[PDB]
Amino acid sequence: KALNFGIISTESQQNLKPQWTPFLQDMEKKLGVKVNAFFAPDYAGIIQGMRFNKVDIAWYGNLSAMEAVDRANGQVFAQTVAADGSPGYWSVLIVNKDSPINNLNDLLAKRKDLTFGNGDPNSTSGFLVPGYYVFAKNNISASDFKRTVNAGHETNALAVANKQVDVATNNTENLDKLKTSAPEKLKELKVIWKSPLIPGDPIVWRKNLSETTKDKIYDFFMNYGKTPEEKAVLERLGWAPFRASSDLQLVPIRQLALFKEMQSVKDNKLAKTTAIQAQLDDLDRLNNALSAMSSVSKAVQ
Amino acid sequence: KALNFGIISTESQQNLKPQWTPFLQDMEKKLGVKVNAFFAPDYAGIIQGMRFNKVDIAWYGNLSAMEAVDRANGQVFAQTVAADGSPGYWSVLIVNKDSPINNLNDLLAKRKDLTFGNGDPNSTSGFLVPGYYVFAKNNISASDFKRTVNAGHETNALAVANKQVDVATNNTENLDKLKTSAPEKLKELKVIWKSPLIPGDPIVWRKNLSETTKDKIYDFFMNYGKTPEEKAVLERLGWAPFRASSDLQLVPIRQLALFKEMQSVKDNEQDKLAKTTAIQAQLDDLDRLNNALSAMSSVSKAVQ
């Protein structure tokens, strides 16, 4: 039998395969089943792929994971851990080093005369986060720009670098990826804005996978990275060994999405605002619980 | 609009009310709404009460909270904390001091000539925890005693005390409540067996309460105990200030209930197969969730 492992379109296939192919062959080696990379032109392709069971396991951002959870019978089971021990990563806006656009106030003032590279609409760092803090908060909108395009991170970072779009979203992980796939191009970019912290990406599976397959997948993730060859495979990817995780890691990204929905709703007391405040309160209370939690042993068998 | 507050039948009403009346009156005073105690003869009355929206918020043990989450649209929002700093409480078996039973081996050999006081079938410490570690692990059940009866913690401790039943379940918190209500009855008791750690009791509400009511209850619980008067009320209950909690506190009791179910099933053939594998699937899920909870760090909280 065979497993299909979804890879989000952060970068071109040609640039993802050197990082991924060796990880997937090792997954093949340990599991004793064939493992195929499953690519798509946008995050949506992976999410729908999982919904129709063409994807079994996937690397997602928190937003595309949340969607998979909500729409595609998905479930978080591990979390990536940045190799340098960053507690997460960050969203950015970039422009070419030669731009006179130096910051948000410049961008807000000039937006109707600029070309904008917006992110994949299911991207956490690419779409949602700048969507809230830069756009929603300043009640400006992406439609304002002379020209606006939703594109993957590499695409946006290369278009800025090549002076082909004035400004774009990106993230700090993908900028380090660019260091490797196109170093002279990274030299051409300037970060003009940086979001608050975003948590590491989840690995997610479909919940109708057999218990045996779930076990094998979970054991593989939890145990990868102990030998020199595996440790290497992880570094290329930007990662130390995975951490156990659950849908709970998604919480602030749910909060962020509801913050943004509220800004929108008010800009248009409404029932809608109460249904959303309900949801916010639920997440606030759960956040308090998570911080207050002491210890958690296995119930002694 | 009146709020019904459920209180499990650990003790008699008359021993509950002086702990609970001051607490519910301060809650009325703070919330600006009428609060009424809801009692019932067994734990099931509280859980079923909430299921049909007759109980709005309740003090439960872990097991009965679990089934209020599964049956009664419940949700944990706070956890009680022992006043003396204990991280939890313990289940026990108790006999009269005059009895020669001194432990589990002493008990099991003689089990045929003994009368046994089991717990409320929805009680964590009364029924589940002994039902697993004493009964399932020693491959016996409560019917393997000469006579078996199901009762609340105070009923059981008073029956052992008055030499009306030879051995019963109880817990260390209730023994403390009996030291208060019936001190001359407590000194007649001796503990012969003690369970692993049980986590503090949660406070639970029904999820279909208005978000407004939920917010005011939540604020009430998180802020109670600032003044000498509130401190005294908590003290009477044997509690310090509450802490934020969620359904997540219930994971080890879900584990334990499933461990027990798997053993009960082994000892009731196609139907055993279908059930165990459904049980095992639930345990693997809880296992992964537990590993996730121990690995978490300084929780990420959206910056508005």
UniProtKB/TrEMBL annotation, chain A:
Q: Which InterPro entries match?
A: PhnD, Phosphnate-bd
For this protein, the record's CDD domains field holds: PBP2_PnhD
Entry's Gene Ontology cellular component terms: ATP-binding cassette (ABC) transporter complex; cell envelope
A Pfam match: Phosphonate-bd
Q: Which UniProt keywords apply?
A: Signal, Transport
The alphabetized list of GO BP terms reads:
organic phosphonate transport; transmembrane transport
So which domain of life are we looking at?
A: Bacteria
Protein localization: Cell envelope
Per the similarity annotation, which family is this?
Belongs to the phosphate/phosphite/phosphonate binding protein family.
Against PANTHER family, the record matches this protein to: PHOSPHONATES TRANSPORT SYSTEM PERMEASE PROTEIN (PTHR30043), PHOSPHONATES-BINDING PERIPLASMIC PROTEIN (PTHR30043:SF10)
Name used for this protein in its record: PhnD, subunit of alkylphosphonate ABC transporter
Q: Which organism is it from?
A: Escherichia coli (strain UTI89 / UPEC)
**What is the gene name?**
phnD
